[PDB]
Write a protein that binds this ligand. Sequence first.
Ligand SMILES: NC[C@@H]1O[C@H](O[C@H]2[C@@H](O)[C@H](O[C@@H]3[C@@H](O)[C@H](N)C[C@H](N)[C@H]3O[C@H]3O[C@H](CO)[C@@H](O)[C@H](O)[C@H]3N)O[C@@H]2CO)[C@H](N)[C@@H](O)[C@@H]1O
Ligand SMILES: [Mg+2]
Ligand SMILES: [Mg+2]
Ligand SMILES: [Mg+2]
Ligand SMILES: [Mg+2]
Ligand SMILES: [Mg+2]
Ligand SMILES: [Mg+2]
Ligand SMILES: [Mg+2]
Ligand SMILES: [Mg+2]
Ligand SMILES: [Mg+2]
Ligand SMILES: [Mg+2]
Ligand SMILES: [Mg+2]
Ligand SMILES: [Mg+2]
Ligand SMILES: [Mg+2]
Ligand SMILES: [Mg+2]
Ligand SMILES: [Mg+2]
Ligand SMILES: [Mg+2]
Ligand SMILES: [Mg+2]
Ligand SMILES: [Mg+2]
Ligand SMILES: [Mg+2]
Ligand SMILES: [Mg+2]
Ligand SMILES: [Mg+2]
Ligand SMILES: [Mg+2]
Ligand SMILES: [Mg+2]
Ligand SMILES: [Mg+2]
Ligand SMILES: [Mg+2]
Ligand SMILES: [Mg+2]
Ligand SMILES: [Mg+2]
Ligand SMILES: [Mg+2]
Ligand SMILES: [Mg+2]
Ligand SMILES: [Mg+2]
Ligand SMILES: [Mg+2]
Ligand SMILES: [Mg+2]
Ligand SMILES: [Mg+2]
Ligand SMILES: [Mg+2]
Ligand SMILES: [Mg+2]
Ligand SMILES: [Mg+2]
Ligand SMILES: [Mg+2]
Ligand SMILES: [Mg+2]
Ligand SMILES: [Mg+2]
Ligand SMILES: [Mg+2]
Ligand SMILES: [Mg+2]
Ligand SMILES: [Mg+2]
Ligand SMILES: [Mg+2]
Ligand SMILES: [Mg+2]
Ligand SMILES: [Mg+2]
Ligand SMILES: [Mg+2]
Ligand SMILES: [Mg+2]
Ligand SMILES: [Mg+2]
Ligand SMILES: [Mg+2]
Ligand SMILES: [Mg+2]
Ligand SMILES: [Mg+2]
Ligand SMILES: [Mg+2]
Ligand SMILES: [Mg+2]
Ligand SMILES: [Mg+2]
Ligand SMILES: [Mg+2]
Ligand SMILES: [Mg+2]
Ligand SMILES: [Mg+2]
Ligand SMILES: [Mg+2]
Ligand SMILES: [Mg+2]
Ligand SMILES: [Mg+2]
Ligand SMILES: [Mg+2]
Ligand SMILES: [Mg+2]
Ligand SMILES: [Mg+2]
Ligand SMILES: [Mg+2]
Ligand SMILES: [Mg+2]
Ligand SMILES: [Mg+2]
Ligand SMILES: [Mg+2]
Ligand SMILES: [Mg+2]
Ligand SMILES: [Mg+2]
Ligand SMILES: [Mg+2]
Ligand SMILES: [Mg+2]
Ligand SMILES: [Mg+2]
Ligand SMILES: [Mg+2]
Ligand SMILES: [Mg+2]
Ligand SMILES: [Mg+2]
Ligand SMILES: [Mg+2]
Ligand SMILES: [Mg+2]
Ligand SMILES: [Mg+2]
Ligand SMILES: [Mg+2]
Ligand SMILES: [Mg+2]
Ligand SMILES: [Mg+2]
Ligand SMILES: [Mg+2]
Ligand SMILES: [Mg+2]
Ligand SMILES: [Mg+2]
Ligand SMILES: [Mg+2]
Ligand SMILES: [Mg+2]
Ligand SMILES: [Mg+2]
Ligand SMILES: [Mg+2]
Ligand SMILES: [Mg+2]
Ligand SMILES: [Mg+2]
Ligand SMILES: [Mg+2]
Ligand SMILES: [Mg+2]
Ligand SMILES: [Mg+2]
Ligand SMILES: [Mg+2]
Ligand SMILES: [Mg+2]
Ligand SMILES: [Mg+2]
Ligand SMILES: [Mg+2]
Ligand SMILES: [Mg+2]
Ligand SMILES: [Mg+2]
Ligand SMILES: [Mg+2]
Ligand SMILES: [Mg+2]
Ligand SMILES: [Mg+2]
Ligand SMILES: [Mg+2]
Ligand SMILES: [Mg+2]
Ligand SMILES: [Mg+2]
Ligand SMILES: [Mg+2]
Ligand SMILES: [Mg+2]
Ligand SMILES: [Mg+2]
Ligand SMILES: [Mg+2]
Ligand SMILES: [Mg+2]
Ligand SMILES: [Mg+2]
Ligand SMILES: [Mg+2]
Ligand SMILES: [Mg+2]
Ligand SMILES: [Mg+2]
Ligand SMILES: [Mg+2]
Ligand SMILES: [Mg+2]
Ligand SMILES: [Mg+2]
Ligand SMILES: [Mg+2]
Ligand SMILES: [Mg+2]
Ligand SMILES: [Mg+2]
Ligand SMILES: [Mg+2]
Ligand SMILES: [Mg+2]
Ligand SMILES: [Mg+2]
Ligand SMILES: [Mg+2]
Ligand SMILES: [Mg+2]
Ligand SMILES: [Mg+2]
Ligand SMILES: [Mg+2]
Ligand SMILES: [Mg+2]
Ligand SMILES: [Mg+2]
Ligand SMILES: [Mg+2]
Ligand SMILES: [Mg+2]
Ligand SMILES: [Mg+2]
Ligand SMILES: [Mg+2]
Ligand SMILES: [Mg+2]
Ligand SMILES: [Mg+2]
Ligand SMILES: [Mg+2]
Ligand SMILES: [Mg+2]
Ligand SMILES: [Mg+2]
Ligand SMILES: [Mg+2]
Ligand SMILES: [Mg+2]
Ligand SMILES: [Mg+2]
Ligand SMILES: [Mg+2]
Ligand SMILES: [Mg+2]
Ligand SMILES: [Mg+2]
Ligand SMILES: [Mg+2]
Ligand SMILES: [Mg+2]
Ligand SMILES: [Mg+2]
Ligand SMILES: [Mg+2]
Ligand SMILES: [Mg+2]
Ligand SMILES: [Mg+2]
Ligand SMILES: [Mg+2]
Ligand SMILES: [Mg+2]
Ligand SMILES: [Mg+2]
Ligand SMILES: [Mg+2]
Ligand SMILES: [Mg+2]
Ligand SMILES: [Mg+2]
Ligand SMILES: [Mg+2]
Ligand SMILES: [Mg+2]
Ligand SMILES: [Mg+2]
Ligand SMILES: [Mg+2]
Ligand SMILES: [Mg+2]
Ligand SMILES: [Mg+2]
Ligand SMILES: [Mg+2]
Lengths: 48, 271
Amino acid sequence: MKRTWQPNRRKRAKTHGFRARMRTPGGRKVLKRRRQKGRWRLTPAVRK
Amino acid sequence: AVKKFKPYTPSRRFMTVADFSEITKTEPEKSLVKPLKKTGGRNNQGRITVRFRGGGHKRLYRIIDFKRWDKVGIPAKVAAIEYDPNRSARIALLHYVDGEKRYIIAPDGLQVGQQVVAGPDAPIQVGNALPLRFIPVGTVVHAVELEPKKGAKLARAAGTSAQIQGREGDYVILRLPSGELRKVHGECYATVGAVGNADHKNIVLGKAGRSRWLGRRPHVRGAAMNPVDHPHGGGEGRAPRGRPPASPWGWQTKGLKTRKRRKPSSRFIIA
RNA sequence: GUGGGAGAGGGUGGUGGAAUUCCCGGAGUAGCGGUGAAAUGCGCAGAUACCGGGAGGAACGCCGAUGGCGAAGGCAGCCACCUGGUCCACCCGUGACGCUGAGGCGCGAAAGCGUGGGGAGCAAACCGGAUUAGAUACCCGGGUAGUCCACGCCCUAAACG
RNA sequence: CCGAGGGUAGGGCCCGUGACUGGGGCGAAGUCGUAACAAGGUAGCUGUACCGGAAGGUGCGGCUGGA
RNA sequence: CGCGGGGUGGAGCAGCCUGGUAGCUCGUCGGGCUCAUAACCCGAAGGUCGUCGGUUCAAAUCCGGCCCCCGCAACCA
RNA sequence: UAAAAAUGUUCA
RNA sequence: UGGUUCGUGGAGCCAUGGGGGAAUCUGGGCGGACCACCGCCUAAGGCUAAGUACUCCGGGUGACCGAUAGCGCACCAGUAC
RNA sequence: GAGCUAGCCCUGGCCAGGGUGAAGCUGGGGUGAGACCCAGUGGAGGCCCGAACCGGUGGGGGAUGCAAACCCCUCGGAUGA
RNA sequence: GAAUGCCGGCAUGAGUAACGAUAAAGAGGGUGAGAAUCCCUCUCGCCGUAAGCCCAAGGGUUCCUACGCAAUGGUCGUCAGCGUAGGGUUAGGCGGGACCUAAGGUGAAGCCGAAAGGCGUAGCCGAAGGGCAGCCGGUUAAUAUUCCGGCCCUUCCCGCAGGUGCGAUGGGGGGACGCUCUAGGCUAGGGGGACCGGAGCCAUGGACGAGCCCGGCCAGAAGCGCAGGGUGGGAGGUAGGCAAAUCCGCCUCCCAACAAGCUCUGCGUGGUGGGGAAGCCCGGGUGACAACCCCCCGAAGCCAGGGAGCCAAGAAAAGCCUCUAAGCACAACCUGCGGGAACCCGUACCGCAAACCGACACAGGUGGGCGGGUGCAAGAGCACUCAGGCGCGCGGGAGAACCCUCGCCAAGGAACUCUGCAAGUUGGCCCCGUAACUUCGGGAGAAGGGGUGCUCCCUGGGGUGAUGAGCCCCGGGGAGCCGCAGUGAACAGGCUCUGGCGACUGUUUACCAAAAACACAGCUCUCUGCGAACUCGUAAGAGGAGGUAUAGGGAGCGACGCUUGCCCGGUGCCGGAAGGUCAAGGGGAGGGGUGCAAGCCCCGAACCGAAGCCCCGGUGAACGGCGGCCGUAACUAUAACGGUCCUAAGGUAGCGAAAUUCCUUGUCGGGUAAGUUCCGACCUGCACGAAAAGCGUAACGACCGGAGCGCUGUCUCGGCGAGGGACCCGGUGAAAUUGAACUGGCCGUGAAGAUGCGGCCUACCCGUGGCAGGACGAAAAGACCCCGUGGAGCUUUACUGCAGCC
RNA sequence: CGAUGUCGGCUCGUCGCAUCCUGGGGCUGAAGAAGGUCCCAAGGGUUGGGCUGUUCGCCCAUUAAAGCGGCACGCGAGCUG
Ligand SMILES: NC[C@@H]1O[C@H](O[C@H]2[C@@H](O)[C@H](O[C@@H]3[C@@H](O)[C@H](N)C[C@H](N)[C@H]3O[C@H]3O[C@H](CO)[C@@H](O)[C@H](O)[C@H]3N)O[C@@H]2CO)[C@H](N)[C@@H](O)[C@@H]1O
Ligand SMILES: [Mg+2]
Ligand SMILES: [Mg+2]
Ligand SMILES: [Mg+2]
Ligand SMILES: [Mg+2]
Ligand SMILES: [Mg+2]
Ligand SMILES: [Mg+2]
Ligand SMILES: [Mg+2]
Ligand SMILES: [Mg+2]
Ligand SMILES: [Mg+2]
Ligand SMILES: [Mg+2]
Ligand SMILES: [Mg+2]
Ligand SMILES: [Mg+2]
Ligand SMILES: [Mg+2]
Ligand SMILES: [Mg+2]
Ligand SMILES: [Mg+2]
Ligand SMILES: [Mg+2]
Ligand SMILES: [Mg+2]
Ligand SMILES: [Mg+2]
Ligand SMILES: [Mg+2]
Ligand SMILES: [Mg+2]
Ligand SMILES: [Mg+2]
Ligand SMILES: [Mg+2]
Ligand SMILES: [Mg+2]
Ligand SMILES: [Mg+2]
Ligand SMILES: [Mg+2]
Ligand SMILES: [Mg+2]
Ligand SMILES: [Mg+2]
Ligand SMILES: [Mg+2]
Ligand SMILES: [Mg+2]
Ligand SMILES: [Mg+2]
Ligand SMILES: [Mg+2]
Ligand SMILES: [Mg+2]
Ligand SMILES: [Mg+2]
Ligand SMILES: [Mg+2]
Ligand SMILES: [Mg+2]
Ligand SMILES: [Mg+2]
Ligand SMILES: [Mg+2]
Ligand SMILES: [Mg+2]
Ligand SMILES: [Mg+2]
Ligand SMILES: [Mg+2]
Ligand SMILES: [Mg+2]
Ligand SMILES: [Mg+2]
Ligand SMILES: [Mg+2]
Ligand SMILES: [Mg+2]
Ligand SMILES: [Mg+2]
Ligand SMILES: [Mg+2]
Ligand SMILES: [Mg+2]
Ligand SMILES: [Mg+2]
Ligand SMILES: [Mg+2]
Ligand SMILES: [Mg+2]
Ligand SMILES: [Mg+2]
Ligand SMILES: [Mg+2]
Ligand SMILES: [Mg+2]
Ligand SMILES: [Mg+2]
Ligand SMILES: [Mg+2]
Ligand SMILES: [Mg+2]
Ligand SMILES: [Mg+2]
Ligand SMILES: [Mg+2]
Ligand SMILES: [Mg+2]
Ligand SMILES: [Mg+2]
Ligand SMILES: [Mg+2]
Ligand SMILES: [Mg+2]
Ligand SMILES: [Mg+2]
Ligand SMILES: [Mg+2]
Ligand SMILES: [Mg+2]
Ligand SMILES: [Mg+2]
Ligand SMILES: [Mg+2]
Ligand SMILES: [Mg+2]
Ligand SMILES: [Mg+2]
Ligand SMILES: [Mg+2]
Ligand SMILES: [Mg+2]
Ligand SMILES: [Mg+2]
Ligand SMILES: [Mg+2]
Ligand SMILES: [Mg+2]
Ligand SMILES: [Mg+2]
Ligand SMILES: [Mg+2]
Ligand SMILES: [Mg+2]
Ligand SMILES: [Mg+2]
Ligand SMILES: [Mg+2]
Ligand SMILES: [Mg+2]
Ligand SMILES: [Mg+2]
Ligand SMILES: [Mg+2]
Ligand SMILES: [Mg+2]
Ligand SMILES: [Mg+2]
Ligand SMILES: [Mg+2]
Ligand SMILES: [Mg+2]
Ligand SMILES: [Mg+2]
Ligand SMILES: [Mg+2]
Ligand SMILES: [Mg+2]
Ligand SMILES: [Mg+2]
Ligand SMILES: [Mg+2]
Ligand SMILES: [Mg+2]
Ligand SMILES: [Mg+2]
Ligand SMILES: [Mg+2]
Ligand SMILES: [Mg+2]
Ligand SMILES: [Mg+2]
Ligand SMILES: [Mg+2]
Ligand SMILES: [Mg+2]
Ligand SMILES: [Mg+2]
Ligand SMILES: [Mg+2]
Ligand SMILES: [Mg+2]
Ligand SMILES: [Mg+2]
Ligand SMILES: [Mg+2]
Ligand SMILES: [Mg+2]
Ligand SMILES: [Mg+2]
Ligand SMILES: [Mg+2]
Ligand SMILES: [Mg+2]
Ligand SMILES: [Mg+2]
Ligand SMILES: [Mg+2]
Ligand SMILES: [Mg+2]
Ligand SMILES: [Mg+2]
Ligand SMILES: [Mg+2]
Ligand SMILES: [Mg+2]
Ligand SMILES: [Mg+2]
Ligand SMILES: [Mg+2]
Ligand SMILES: [Mg+2]
Ligand SMILES: [Mg+2]
Ligand SMILES: [Mg+2]
Ligand SMILES: [Mg+2]
Ligand SMILES: [Mg+2]
Ligand SMILES: [Mg+2]
Ligand SMILES: [Mg+2]
Ligand SMILES: [Mg+2]
Ligand SMILES: [Mg+2]
Ligand SMILES: [Mg+2]
Ligand SMILES: [Mg+2]
Ligand SMILES: [Mg+2]
Ligand SMILES: [Mg+2]
Ligand SMILES: [Mg+2]
Ligand SMILES: [Mg+2]
Ligand SMILES: [Mg+2]
Ligand SMILES: [Mg+2]
Ligand SMILES: [Mg+2]
Ligand SMILES: [Mg+2]
Ligand SMILES: [Mg+2]
Ligand SMILES: [Mg+2]
Ligand SMILES: [Mg+2]
Ligand SMILES: [Mg+2]
Ligand SMILES: [Mg+2]
Ligand SMILES: [Mg+2]
Ligand SMILES: [Mg+2]
Ligand SMILES: [Mg+2]
Ligand SMILES: [Mg+2]
Ligand SMILES: [Mg+2]
Ligand SMILES: [Mg+2]
Ligand SMILES: [Mg+2]
Ligand SMILES: [Mg+2]
Ligand SMILES: [Mg+2]
Ligand SMILES: [Mg+2]
Ligand SMILES: [Mg+2]
Ligand SMILES: [Mg+2]
Ligand SMILES: [Mg+2]
Ligand SMILES: [Mg+2]
Ligand SMILES: [Mg+2]
Ligand SMILES: [Mg+2]
Ligand SMILES: [Mg+2]
Ligand SMILES: [Mg+2]
Ligand SMILES: [Mg+2]
Ligand SMILES: [Mg+2]
Ligand SMILES: [Mg+2]
Ligand SMILES: [Mg+2]
Ligand SMILES: [Mg+2]
Ligand SMILES: [Mg+2]
């Protein structure tokens, strides 16, 4: 049956994007933890 | 007249529709800077701020002239009389002699090929629009401005009208279609006569749907809504309000007077 | 046919004043009201009485008559438009073309019903005050339909000469 | 092939009967008021309308079969 | 079983709360008005205050025991 | 436009 | 109203949203209501090292661990998942 | 976090084939004119049967399942809220 | 050693359950160390609005090829969507971008907010929308309207020639648009042919037969036909297009008009290009220089912005025409013809799925397009079947119980049961023929029936043709034949009577409730005059509304019919410029602390002081509420009548043991052999009752109740049979649970239901198939109950605040 | 209470006796036939329906009779619900 994850690449970049984060002051403050933690991906990986 | 329908299906036995004679001859709207895209969703920025709106026929806006005092003394031949889905009332399409054409809310008796005009100069006959101060006391008029130069805002519903009761100072006194009794500036313009299509009040939607067509979503009593949801809500199975009638926000809904006591508008009114 | 006459005959649109009620302004006091007698009620939060100004509804005094018109029901301020019936004279025109009328169709006071409007006065129901052995009556103070208009029904009556 | 009748099914007319229920007629001396006949002590009657233990009361119009 | 209310002339109710005094309406009895009946008028009689004790000098009245009256509650599994 | 006033068993 | 130990308390002092509203040293503020003496200091402009804090980084010690310990990672982990 | 779910906005798409037979017309009849009654034409409908599609009514299976809601039979709607 | 402790390892159950849809397999060859499982061939079965083709999304090399199989493959594997390696995705005309705007996002200005930030004009961003130039074949192991072949277009720049006042982001036109139903021509697609072209075939009795088998196309500019869509031409004036215009819009008038012409598509034709079966011989050849014609059916597509009707009244901007403005007219556009110029991104492969969403090659979920033939009325339905793809990755046997899915059954026939639950009967089309009731539409497909094959003859209409043959499409009438049977297979209701609730279609608890619940048209009350009320927000602002009382919000009631009574004492709301009360504040009589004083400070009485409360009235489709006791009639009974008490008033109409009645299976009546259910009545209605509506109501209902008829394993009562498991063999191989175990019965005893204590009785050791009584059997540190001065959600005339409003 | 799933039905029963029936027996106000009461005796039997969820009852038609109890008001790792 129609499950929770239903991928859409446009929706992924628009939502957890990078330009996407950087807008919100919370979103900038994500990158910070992420980047300070030493993640290899500050953003969900999804290519066009 | 209102058409009725034979009971070959319920919902459509109680149904009635507008008499559509007074219109015809033109049904496609006068494109010429006359329609506009009409933006159309229930709420404001995020949140619904008028419960129970939505759906309902795609609909286009006719921009209508509500302050006739531009083309003053310019006369104008009424081209036809059409349907506007943004009002209870009919609107007529006139062609001025400038060439310039505008929509106007179409009063009872107004018939195609009438000359018609605005200004003080103007003769007291249907569809002509004068400054109240120049209008003969106790005639019926419609689309009255309230503060002068701020446009028409009174009497515009299907078949409504204000009547004059006489002047007193710079203000004339009108009985509004509500019955109230407002001193109004004489400089307010107002087109003469009653708004007609007054068989409107006579129509029966008939079925659940139809309502939807006009984009009026279903509505639910406070009862059948849990207590968290609403005053009247709750109680083990059907129970007499609770005391006393309230909006789902908390305010008495039988009786409780609402307008601003200390408002300036007060002291021009009387009814 | 011609030429004249009288009439609240009917439908429509407009309009005049008197009076009642309410609103406002003024002035002015202690009672007004109502009854067989009272009380209920109203009023010193300033009523009744008087003056001015405004709204609204309904009905139309005098003329009015024991009068007139209409087939009946019925019809009464004034004006105009549309329209029915009727009498008279002239004796001109048609040539018995007539009377009645089972059905059918039409109209039809009041109350009553439906859809809108309107609502001053009155007033079924209803509340109160009395009266009475009891008053669900008669009398009194209130009062909703209704009474009014448009359209659509009902279509009965001591619709009686 | 018709065909008496039998069967199946659904109708219409009529008669009898039925717990219970509506009003009616009639039966010397039961109870409650007294509406009407003399302005029957609110003139009467009437069509309608609502109401009331009951006769009845009131509204609206009508008659005179009263003044 | 529970909690609370009430037994007062013949009928319906007052009187108990801050003990000494039992009142209203109807009825009933005598007497009037009428020719009579009702109505009305004038007069009067009528109560162990459910009961068994005890508090007080005094108890319808304050206190416990029952007899009937009337109401409310009797829930969760 | 008149005050407050109900009633009278059956049969001859 | 906040600050101070001060939670209205005899409650001043320091700030200050609202109202009123001076003077320039015979001018002003304070010394815990308030006056009187006696003293302290000079408001409504501003700058100013040092001693103080922390340690992503480097160095040295460790009656600190010794791979279920020690940082989540002694091992291409903030990965695979 | 509305890439599931609920609502709304903009923009596109989809609904086989059957079966009833509204109004309007057109003709005839009717009347003073009408109301109106007949056939024929006409395709109305939160109309009916029935896929697709949207649901999930009753029963059975399943219950460390094929599946953290599934399968079989049956059933509601299907130009409309 | 104990924390249902933490991590890791390894046991038990177990060689057990299971190996993922009952669409299905068999054999002969090969390859190999070895294969039911890989390759080939011949049979057989399954899908086919498909389990078949083409896209979009998502995935992301899974595509192709050469080597391989350790692990992944629930068995095997010589195979693979697996490991290693190498190849593979070619565009000016396809999709997206150097075009446009939609919701919405952002956002110069401008407004707002302690900060972070929030609104918002123009503008820009934003698309399966508008705009825009490619069709057909051929090649690769794997790519192509992308390479190539043929035919056909698009833009820019430049040059030449010929024409014109050229000229904007500005003006106007246009783009531009709903639903439903249809006209005519075509086209896609398909069915025939005694015609054309073909390898072959007579095979078992017969047929060389207008026999059987197979195929008889596709694209194509100019020009031309055939269907249509769009479209009046004029000349003057002009107070409008925020007039800058000879453009548009308005008027006034010589002509013309169910037209003609101009113009733009569709389709046919077309120089010519390409394709071209079956079969047979090894994907290729041959079948060939293949044939490539006629007729019939025919669209949901094309001409299309065509027409008609209806209302709930149906996007925007650009390209595209046109008009002028600055400016420039050696400019500049416009029309031909030439040369040149034409980028960035995606092109593999899966794609209803073993390559996407579900941890799994998970019987689930997934948008668009094509979807052949025959028959059944039609159809994307059903049965078989083209093309094309499959046999679903564990098998071989045996045939017990038992389980699932399925078929049949004597006599009966709901006797089963909470309930005919389940299953059965019914079941398509055509024609008869159908009741009460009704709002006249319905109820109706009511019921109850008859027909339903094939053969021959006669006969009526239509479409295509030419009125005439064919070819299809609707009929009517006669005779005759065969069976148990003719919608002989498959897909297609059981019917009725009578209550309850809700009017009706609709909606809901995704995962136990689809309903008498919600919604619904309609009814009433109330608020709101418009910078409306109301809602969201600190505000700005926005919704309401680019609306305006025949309008908007709140509340309840719920089609429709007949109706909706009495009490405002109390609570609420509404109305009362008199009063009582009242906070700051005003006011200061009078008092007090200090100083030698001027003074500086404290308290502080009358009085003047708002809303609110009090008080006065009003208001029920505002919250609410609508009694008791005793007596009475010439038989008894009953009580029209009376008395008295209390209330704010004391339940009217209509219903009534009712979804409401406790006593109750109330008491009669009906139905039944028998009925605590049901229907009809009565009515001491423990606790009906009028818009939390009252009483009714045709039609509706996968709603709840009662009764018939029909038919049946539901049952008396069971039996037989089919397949899929269960059992046996081979292969792979789990689970919860588990103090350890050498884990019998009775009578007892024991913390009160002992295998483990006592007495006694039985009892060789070990398994396999079964059954389920016990191990107070497993599972979830009981949901119930209590406890915790534990926690939440909810309410109000609990307390204290706060938003809001006065 | 780190859970012993509750009424009724169905299926399968088993045991007790204070025996409903059948077999013995003593009294009887036992003439006979029927009965009354008490004693011995469960070996085996101890029906089908209507109503209600019902156990229980009350009815219909029978019968030799239509017994009463225990077994966690026997039995849900057997079913129903
Ligand atoms: N038959 C007359 C109609 O019925 C009624 O009449 C009946 C009754 O009303 C009437 O009853 C009367 C009563 O009215 C009057 N006030 C008292 C009288 N004793 C009664 O009498 C009645 O009952 C008694 C027995 O009790 C019988 O003996 C007597 O015959 C009978 N008439 O007697 C009639 C029966 O016979 C209506 N009242 C009358 O108006 C109507 O027109
Ligand atoms: Mg996308
Ligand atoms: Mg936002
Ligand atoms: Mg609602
Ligand atoms: Mg609820
Ligand atoms: Mg409330
Ligand atoms: Mg609340
Ligand atoms: Mg309730
Ligand atoms: Mg409530
Ligand atoms: Mg006055
Ligand atoms: Mg005349
Ligand atoms: Mg009348
Ligand atoms: Mg009435
Ligand atoms: Mg009326
Ligand atoms: Mg009056
Ligand atoms: Mg008297
Ligand atoms: Mg009166
Ligand atoms: Mg009349
Ligand atoms: Mg008369
Ligand atoms: Mg026969
Ligand atoms: Mg007698
Ligand atoms: Mg009288
Ligand atoms: Mg009398
Ligand atoms: Mg009289
Ligand atoms: Mg008289
Ligand atoms: Mg009368
Ligand atoms: Mg009556
Ligand atoms: Mg009366
Ligand atoms: Mg009268
Ligand atoms: Mg008493
Ligand atoms: Mg007494
Ligand atoms: Mg005494
Ligand atoms: Mg006496
Ligand atoms: Mg309970
Ligand atoms: Mg008497
Ligand atoms: Mg007498
Ligand atoms: Mg006698
Ligand atoms: Mg502080
Ligand atoms: Mg300050
Ligand atoms: Mg100091
Ligand atoms: Mg000091
Ligand atoms: Mg100091
Ligand atoms: Mg500093
Ligand atoms: Mg070491
Ligand atoms: Mg570690
Ligand atoms: Mg080690
Ligand atoms: Mg670690
Ligand atoms: Mg969503
Ligand atoms: Mg005609
Ligand atoms: Mg017709
Ligand atoms: Mg439908
Ligand atoms: Mg349907
Ligand atoms: Mg269906
Ligand atoms: Mg189906
Ligand atoms: Mg749903
Ligand atoms: Mg199940
Ligand atoms: Mg099970
Ligand atoms: Mg279905
Ligand atoms: Mg220990
Ligand atoms: Mg465990
Ligand atoms: Mg472990
Ligand atoms: Mg085992
Ligand atoms: Mg086994
Ligand atoms: Mg097995
Ligand atoms: Mg098969
Ligand atoms: Mg093989
Ligand atoms: Mg097949
Ligand atoms: Mg992709
Ligand atoms: Mg491959
Ligand atoms: Mg290989
Ligand atoms: Mg391997
Ligand atoms: Mg393997
Ligand atoms: Mg590979
Ligand atoms: Mg743009
Ligand atoms: Mg923004
Ligand atoms: Mg696009
Ligand atoms: Mg596009
Ligand atoms: Mg390929
Ligand atoms: Mg090419
Ligand atoms: Mg120029
Ligand atoms: Mg030009
Ligand atoms: Mg433009
Ligand atoms: Mg066509
Ligand atoms: Mg073609
Ligand atoms: Mg062919
Ligand atoms: Mg042939
Ligand atoms: Mg040939
Ligand atoms: Mg042969
Ligand atoms: Mg073709
Ligand atoms: Mg043409
Ligand atoms: Mg022209
Ligand atoms: Mg200009
Ligand atoms: Mg061609
Ligand atoms: Mg070939
Ligand atoms: Mg570039
Ligand atoms: Mg490609
Ligand atoms: Mg491809
Ligand atoms: Mg598909
Ligand atoms: Mg598989
Ligand atoms: Mg799958
Ligand atoms: Mg998968
Ligand atoms: Mg789908
Ligand atoms: Mg087919
Ligand atoms: Mg068919
Ligand atoms: Mg199919
Ligand atoms: Mg398999
Ligand atoms: Mg049988
Ligand atoms: Mg048989
Ligand atoms: Mg039974
Ligand atoms: Mg039974
Ligand atoms: Mg019948
Ligand atoms: Mg019926
Ligand atoms: Mg029926
Ligand atoms: Mg319903
Ligand atoms: Mg429906
Ligand atoms: Mg659910
Ligand atoms: Mg369900
Ligand atoms: Mg449902
Ligand atoms: Mg619901
Ligand atoms: Mg209604
Ligand atoms: Mg707006
Ligand atoms: Mg409104
Ligand atoms: Mg409203
Ligand atoms: Mg309701
Ligand atoms: Mg009240
Ligand atoms: Mg009140
Ligand atoms: Mg009051
Ligand atoms: Mg007030
Ligand atoms: Mg003060
Ligand atoms: Mg005040
Ligand atoms: Mg009484
Ligand atoms: Mg009853
Ligand atoms: Mg009963
Ligand atoms: Mg009750
Ligand atoms: Mg009975
Ligand atoms: Mg009953
Ligand atoms: Mg109720
Ligand atoms: Mg009421
Ligand atoms: Mg109510
Ligand atoms: Mg209701
Ligand atoms: Mg009812
Ligand atoms: Mg439904
Ligand atoms: Mg249902
Ligand atoms: Mg078998
Ligand atoms: Mg094995
Ligand atoms: Mg034991
Ligand atoms: Mg031992
Ligand atoms: Mg032992
Ligand atoms: Mg065993
Ligand atoms: Mg066991
Ligand atoms: Mg077992
Ligand atoms: Mg357990
Ligand atoms: Mg526990
Ligand atoms: Mg609890
Ligand atoms: Mg607590
Ligand atoms: Mg327990
Ligand atoms: Mg345990
Ligand atoms: Mg014995
Ligand atoms: Mg039963
Ligand atoms: Mg037993
Ligand atoms: Mg038990
Ligand atoms: Mg169970
Ligand atoms: Mg058990
Ligand atoms: Mg057990």
